[PDB]
Amino acid sequence: ASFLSSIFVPVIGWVVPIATFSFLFLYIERE
Amino acid sequence: ATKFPKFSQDLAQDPTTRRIWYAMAMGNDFESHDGMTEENLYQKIFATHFGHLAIIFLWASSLLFHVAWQGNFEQWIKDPLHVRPIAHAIWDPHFGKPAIEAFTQAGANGPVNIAYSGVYHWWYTIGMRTNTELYTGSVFLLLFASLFLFAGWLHLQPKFRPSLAWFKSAESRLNHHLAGLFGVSSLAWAGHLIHVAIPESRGQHVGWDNFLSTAPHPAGLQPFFTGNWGVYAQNPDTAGHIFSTSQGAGTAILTFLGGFHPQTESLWLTDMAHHHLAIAVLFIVAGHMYRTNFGIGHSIKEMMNAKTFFGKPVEGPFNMPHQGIYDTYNNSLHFQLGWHLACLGVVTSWVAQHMYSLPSYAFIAKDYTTQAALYTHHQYIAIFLMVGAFAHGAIFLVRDYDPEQNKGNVLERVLQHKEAIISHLSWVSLFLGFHTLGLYVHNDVVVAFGTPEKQILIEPVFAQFIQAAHGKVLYGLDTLLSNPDSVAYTAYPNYANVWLPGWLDAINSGTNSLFLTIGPGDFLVHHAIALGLHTTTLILVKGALDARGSKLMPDKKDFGYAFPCDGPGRGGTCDISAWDSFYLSLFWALNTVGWVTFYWHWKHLGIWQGNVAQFNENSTYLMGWFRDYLWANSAQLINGYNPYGVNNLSVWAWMFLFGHLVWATGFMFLISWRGYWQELIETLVWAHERTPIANLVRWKDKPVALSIVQARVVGLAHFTVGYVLTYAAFLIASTAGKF
Amino acid sequence: SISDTQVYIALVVALIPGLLAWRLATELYK
Amino acid sequence: WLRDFLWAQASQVINSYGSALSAYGLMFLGAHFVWAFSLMFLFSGRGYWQELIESIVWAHNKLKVAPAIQPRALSITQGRAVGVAHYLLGGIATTWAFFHAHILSVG
Amino acid sequence: EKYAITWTSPKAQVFELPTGGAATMHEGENLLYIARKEYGIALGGQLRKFKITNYKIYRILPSGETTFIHPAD
Amino acid sequence: PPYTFRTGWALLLLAVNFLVAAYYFHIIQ
Amino acid sequence: VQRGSKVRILRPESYWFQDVGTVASVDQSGIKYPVIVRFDKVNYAGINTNNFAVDELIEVE
Amino acid sequence: GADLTPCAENPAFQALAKNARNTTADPQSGQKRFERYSQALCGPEGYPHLIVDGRLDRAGDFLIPSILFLYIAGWIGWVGRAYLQAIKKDSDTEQKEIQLDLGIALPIIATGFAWPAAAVKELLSGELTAKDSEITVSPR
Amino acid sequence: SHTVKIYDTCIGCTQCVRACPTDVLEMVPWDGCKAAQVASSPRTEDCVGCKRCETACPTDFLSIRVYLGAETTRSMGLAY
Ligand code: CLA
Ligand code: CLA
Ligand code: CLA
Ligand code: CLA
Ligand SMILES: CC1=C(/C=C/C(C)=C/C=C/C(C)=C/C=C/C=C(C)/C=C/C=C(C)/C=C/C2=C(C)CCCC2(C)C)C(C)(C)CCC1
Ligand SMILES: CC1=C(/C=C/C(C)=C/C=C/C(C)=C\C=C\C=C(C)\C=C\C=C(C)\C=C\C2=C(C)CCCC2(C)C)C(C)(C)CCC1
Ligand SMILES: CC1=C(C/C=C(\C)CCC[C@H](C)CCC[C@H](C)CCCC(C)C)C(=O)c2ccccc2C1=O
Ligand SMILES: CC1=C(C/C=C(\C)CCC[C@H](C)CCC[C@H](C)CCCC(C)C)C(=O)c2ccccc2C1=O
Ligand code: SF4
Ligand code: SF4
């Protein structure tokens, strides 16, 4: 099942930092 | 005026970008949080320690799963001396087609990374044979790491949350951790070797299904209780034992040959079984010493405060005042953390010193690059654990230290004569450096002038003796286990040197790293190491002892541990704080471990290639280090990619250049300091409010330059990461390109 | 190597520490 | 630039022992030293080194070799100036000894 | 705008602005809108070589409040 | 004072320094 | 003490701690540290004079 | 060990004796060092390995230069110590530091050769060291 | 802002008041010293942490001390 690399690596490469940075930027800039 | 960071109202009321950076470097500092009390501190550290513990088991499970699913472990069993292991597989979209063909290696379908951490040798030694045991142990560590993630959550709930007196019960940790964490676990691993790993070493499968049926010994626990323990040391694995087969096998489970297995060139598994069994008895007995609620045992607070040796009045133990040290170790957490990093830092290097000379893993002495990486890894780990020992020891003297509770004791008497400690530390650093650098430059000029016989070469005749006082015939000193008429050789009253015929076979062979042959090139580098240890200690001790103030600046305790300076007054005070003496030392600590690992690596490149004469001639003068090691070995590396093509070393050729760039970037934060950069950002703030379309958007946090203490962190971070990655790309590919 | 089935068991079992890590990291405060 | 210029053209400067280009072999290593020596002044600060002298003046006060002119660390501006003069000296002299021993051999 | 500084000059002469550059004061009461109080004292000492010690730094809030903060009396 | 407890242990350790050198000089075997 | 008396210093935060000074002038009523001591070696600031209390000094002449 | 057979017996030391490089313009300075280095111990490489043990057949390596150095090095300290003892009881003492009082420095230089007879005299009189109550110290 | 502590050892030299560039310091009368005045810091919300006031003080050790605290807009020295 070597096709899981095609679906975990782009999520951790792209989706994981986009979801993390967009959470943290809205959390540090929160009155 | 935001609510981030939660743990500080002084940082959360910062309009600049300093708010963001100081949240990161004060987040895990639990002691400086807002409103943190004493018992809330320990209850939060204890549950955090379940968090770091469960990272370790989740880390070690990915080593098992990525090998079972993507590596070639079952293909590595058949021939461990030529089959090249596999760590994980590459899914990189950015690869070109000649860079998929170059990394399709070790008999695999796709691009794979050759494992240089030696975990196939450790798993093959301890009995694991197929890819299903690796997967089973992987899934077990998923559950065993979740058992700690639940435990840290459970011990934060209000009636499951431990009290303060539970943490400061120090005599009960020492009984349970020595007997149970050290002793039972050494006993359990001896049970794992005897039941499983030693029968797996003889071609005899023992798994979870048939370990209750099969016995490790055909005698079978009857000679244990009757006292006939010599039955366990009957016919061992012979000198023709082919590993994991039944040829030349034995029935013994606890044996004491000493020395190495003749094929794998590792320690005997029957020797390790009687080892961890004997360690287990010495620790369970050690864990029944201190006083708990059962009204028996030694009491440490009474051992410190004792003043009477059999009627004679003394000042304390060894007639030295150790009173109040129990209330100094136990009440402070930085005294404990500063202490135990020194304890863990000693043993970490002590692990590395005994794993190249005494290999304990099957077929690891012949897989070279896995052995060159494990030495250099645990040496650099031992570096940070020793620098942080003095670092967290110096946070103790600023923050936690109380001179009234510690009045008159041995830790007070060090702070009196602290100018005598730093002076004689400053002497040995200069006494070695003036005369070790002097003899390299002497040998450099003398060889350069074509007359190399005028070199000052000193045989290390005080370490020549120890290797001959351990049984090496090669020098002809004829003492002390190399003298066959010696009292130490024969063990005169009892003659019980069982280990000694197997030890002298191992030390007198030139086919291992056991007590390597030393010469005049090894004289200068051990005194160069001693230059690096006494000088790194000089910076760390002087920053520890002067942490509470001195002549140029008294009351440094009022300013905390990390503050920039005290201004340009009094001639200026740049890098005056106790944090700044942590800071200068990590240049030396990375330096000294460079010297101990340039010298480790180049002595073994002569052993592994059969050319011992290259090191012994050329390691006396500093061109032979520069030419025959740095220049000559980086030819396989740098040709990892050239205009003709690529090969499998092109990551290490790319990481080598990457390391030279992170290293050089860190100079920018150290040569140039802050006030140049705040006057540069104030021109970018101007030209953003004036640009007509781009001033629709605007910052929430005002851009300021990095603070003075911050870009000494950030400067040391680019320096240290680039120092590691440069050598780690040179260590691997110069060894894995030559074998 | 291991079978294609066994990889999915490892992923589903890995949600059990993934859930518990989210519970611990939020019980330790925001 | 690393393979075909710095690595490949230095094969005449470091292999030059026992010959007439021996001084360029010694100035190549000797200038790598002075370059690296300059970083002690650039990276560190003045206020560390003044504290260290106070522990060396003590051992000089004890045996009555106390100098009448008091020792001080180099000032903040001078510690930068020493660190750039020793930087430019060892960096250029590396290249001075590298250009000569390469081009006095292939020319 | 914030921190107005006023001073009375005997005549006109060229001084140096704290924001960089040289201007020319009038004769009589002057007025300069600066960014921070640090500019006004660094200007107020530059007036001392012109023998002027009659300078007053205000504090203009964005609401329109002008608080006299130097001197206290 | 004549430091008895300091010099008592320094002469013990120096006697260990001289004993190991006797093995190295073949005085004791 | 008197103008010319060598004294010693016991103030730990002072630069000339356990060093020999020379009293230049002693005042009468105020400050609480009314003794001007002209030292012979300079501190980091470059000065060589300071004020000290009456009980702060140890006369050695 | 390792293979410290003496240099007169070595095939390697005699092979290094045939391609001698003249040190000084003495035309046999190439030869008049190899016969002098024959009593030393050349290993497998052909180079004399010095012995800092203290053996009296090997006293020329370390034992003889150690007495020779420590006489000269304890000289320079003692001359520099006794000068600073003298200038402290003068009018200024800072001028006499950078700008040497040559009338006082020259008697101290000639005095020196009984510095072991003077340092032991200073040691036993208790005038070598100073009191810890008279040296400035840092706050603890 | 920062924190300016003034101890009782100063002599009324008026060198620290004539050196703080945001004019935090001022002299108040005080019957202790010979010059009969002590420095006082009634406007420490304006202090920028410059430590010009510690550089100019004669007394050993310093009668004035600046403790670097929480940094607002006035103490960062931001014109923006
Ligand atoms: C921390 C441990 C760890 C690390 C560093 C890696 C590293 C890697 N894994 Mg792997 N993995 C692990 C544990 C780990 N594995 C475990 C326990 C499992 C079983 C569930 C897997 C299952 C797995 C699969 C199925 C695949 C990878 C893949 C990969 C590669 C690409 C990264 C990726 O997509 O992640 C994938 C990550 C997951 C599937 C889930 C992560 C599981 C661990 C337990 C999370 C650890 C989080 C960590 C502790 C949080 C701390 C962050 C830190 C910065 C503070 C890379 C070699 C891919 C690959 O080989 O590409 C070629 C791929 O297809 N991994
Ligand atoms: C017998 C009962 C028992 C046991 C098993 C433990 C076990 C433990 N306690 Mg503990 N504890 C106990 C009773 C016990 N405690 C009692 C009674 C008290 C109250 C008085 C405490 C109070 C307490 C506190 C307050 C804390 C602990 C902590 C810990 C953990 C230590 C960290 C760790 O995992 O290191 C594991 C270490 C070893 C397995 C031994 C390592 C030995 C050296 C370093 C290396 C030797 C290995 C060798 C070289 C070979 C390795 C090679 C191989 C890896 C390849 C560990 C799980 C800490 C923790 O993390 O909390 C979770 C912590 O903060 N305990
Ligand atoms: C188990 C050991 C241990 C423990 C529990 C602690 C715990 C602590 N230390 Mg300590 N320390 C340790 C080891 C340890 N340290 C070691 C080994 C050293 C020597 C290097 C130090 C040096 C040290 C200093 C000098 C200081 C502390 C401080 C602290 C406290 C706060 C930590 C903090 O703010 O984190 C914040 C965490 C960070 C800022 C992390 C940034 C650094 C990361 C690791 C860089 C990583 C680079 C990058 C990811 C690499 C990518 C590679 C890629 C490009 C290829 C806390 C009590 C501080 C304190 O004030 O104490 C109260 C403090 O001043 N420690
Ligand atoms: C009068 C000469 C003199 C004397 C007797 C001493 C004596 C001492 N010094 Mg000191 N020192 C001196 C000059 C002197 N120093 C000077 C000029 C410097 C600045 C370079 C230093 C720098 C220095 C350091 C950095 C250290 C000592 C240390 C020591 C002690 C151990 C010996 C040692 O390590 O030598 C050290 C010698 C040097 C570093 C170089 C020697 C300096 C020159 C070459 C000799 C001076 C000769 C003088 C100018 C001749 C004047 C003659 C006069 C008639 C005109 C000892 C108390 C060490 C210590 O504290 O150990 C406990 C220590 O760490 N000293
Ligand atoms: C050889 C041999 C032997 C011996 C051994 C030994 C004896 C060892 C030693 C060892 C040792 C001898 C070790 C040590 C180490 C040390 C260290 C490592 C230290 C460190 C420290 C620290 C770091 C501290 C800290 C701190 C500070 C700094 C401050 C305050 C606080 C504290 C205290 C915490 C025997 C007989 C057995 C056998 C045979 C062989
Ligand atoms: C024999 C021998 C050896 C050994 C040695 C030893 C080990 C020794 C020790 C010794 C010691 C351990 C010593 C110590 C000392 C200490 C002290 C304490 C000193 C004193 C000094 C002083 C005090 C000084 C003075 C002076 C002088 C004399 C001169 C100049 C000036 C002065 C002042 C500087 C060897 C093997 C190497 C080699 C071979 C031979
Ligand atoms: C360049 C430089 C700056 C300017 C640098 C600034 C203003 C920050 C620039 C960083 C930008 C935003 C990129 C940062 C992102 C990194 C590539 C990765 C960081 C990711 C982690 C923070 C998570 C200083 O402020 C400074 C201060 C003191 C000494 C030396 C220096 C210094 O050298
Ligand atoms: C090492 C170092 C020092 C200390 C280094 C010093 C003081 C150099 C002094 C060494 C020379 C050898 C002193 C010379 C003293 C005498 C002239 C020696 C007599 C020898 C003559 C006979 C030739 C600083 O003062 C400093 C200041 C600011 C930033 C960085 C640093 C810095 O890195
Ligand atoms: S604090 Fe300094 S400047 Fe102010 S009155 Fe005292 S001595 Fe003078
Ligand atoms: S912080 Fe220091 S320099 Fe700035 S105004 Fe206040 S006293 Fe003066």
CSV table of N, CA and C in Angstrom, one decimal, chain F residues 5-23:
chain,number,residue,atom,x,y,z
F,5,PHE,N,44.8,16.8,58.7
F,5,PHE,CA,43.8,16.1,57.9
F,5,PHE,C,44.0,16.4,56.4
F,6,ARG,N,44.5,17.5,56.0
F,6,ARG,CA,44.8,17.8,54.6
F,6,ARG,C,46.0,17.0,54.1
F,7,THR,N,47.1,17.1,54.8
F,7,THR,CA,48.3,16.4,54.4
F,7,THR,C,48.2,14.9,54.7
F,8,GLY,N,47.3,14.4,55.5
F,8,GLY,CA,47.1,13.0,55.7
F,8,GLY,C,46.5,12.3,54.5
F,9,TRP,N,45.6,13.0,53.8
F,9,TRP,CA,45.0,12.4,52.6
F,9,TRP,C,45.8,12.7,51.3
F,10,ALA,N,46.6,13.8,51.3
F,10,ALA,CA,47.4,14.0,50.2
F,10,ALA,C,48.6,13.1,50.1
F,11,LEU,N,49.1,12.7,51.3
F,11,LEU,CA,50.2,11.7,51.3
F,11,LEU,C,49.6,10.3,51.1
F,12,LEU,N,48.3,10.0,51.3
F,12,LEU,CA,47.7,8.8,50.9
F,12,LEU,C,47.5,8.7,49.4
F,13,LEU,N,47.1,9.7,48.8
F,13,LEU,CA,46.9,9.7,47.3
F,13,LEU,C,48.3,9.7,46.6
F,14,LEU,N,49.3,10.4,47.2
F,14,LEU,CA,50.6,10.4,46.5
F,14,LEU,C,51.3,9.0,46.7
F,15,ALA,N,50.9,8.3,47.8
F,15,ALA,CA,51.4,6.9,47.9
F,15,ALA,C,50.8,6.0,46.9
F,16,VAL,N,49.6,6.4,46.4
F,16,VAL,CA,49.0,5.6,45.3
F,16,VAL,C,49.7,6.0,44.0
F,17,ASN,N,50.1,7.3,43.8
F,17,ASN,CA,50.8,7.7,42.6
F,17,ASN,C,52.2,7.0,42.6
F,18,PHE,N,52.8,6.7,43.7
F,18,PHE,CA,54.1,6.1,43.7
F,18,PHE,C,54.0,4.6,43.6
F,19,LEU,N,52.9,4.0,44.0
F,19,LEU,CA,52.7,2.6,43.9
F,19,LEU,C,52.6,2.1,42.5
F,20,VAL,N,51.8,2.8,41.7
F,20,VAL,CA,51.5,2.5,40.3
F,20,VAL,C,52.8,2.6,39.5
F,21,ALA,N,53.6,3.6,39.9
F,21,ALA,CA,54.9,3.8,39.2
F,21,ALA,C,55.9,2.7,39.5
F,22,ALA,N,55.7,2.1,40.6
F,22,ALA,CA,56.6,0.9,41.0
F,22,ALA,C,56.3,-0.3,40.1
F,23,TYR,N,55.0,-0.4,39.6
F,23,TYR,CA,54.7,-1.4,38.6
F,23,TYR,C,55.3,-1.0,37.3
